[PDB]
Design a protein around this ligand. Structure first.
Ligand code: NA
Length: 108
């Protein structure tokens, strides 16, 4: 569709466990290596090209950032590129680590 939706980390974790959506983390590389959701793909300007060749526009994509704010602009951007199903995770990594502390990974 032509709008994205904001979802909470419990909802995102369920879509992930169900293999219904992919998770992309748009934080800087240092922040990403210091700890990120298991299974998140590090999506930056430099990795965008690859991401799009690898994930069709019909793939639900959930976007995670620092606190749930920048993921909005990034989600809208992905819609503009042709992605139809895009979400922004309210609370960002902070909420994810709080709710699912055992599901954090380190490094790239
Ligand atoms: Na943010």
């Amino acid at each position: 569709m032509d709008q994205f939706e904001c979802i909470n980390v419990a909802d995102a974790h369920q879509k992930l466990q169900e293999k219904e959506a992919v998770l992309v983390d748009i934080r800087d590389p240092q922040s990403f290596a210091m700890g990120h959701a298991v299974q998140a793909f590090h999506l930056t300007n430099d990795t965008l090209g690859a991401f799009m060749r690898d994930n069709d526009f019909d793939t639900p994509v959930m976007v995670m950032c620092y606190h749930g704010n920048s993921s909005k602009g990034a989600a809208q951007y992905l819609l503009q590129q042709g992605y139809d199903v895009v979400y922004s995770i309210d609370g960002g990594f902070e909420a994810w680590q709080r709710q699912f502390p055992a599901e954090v990974a380190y490094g790239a």
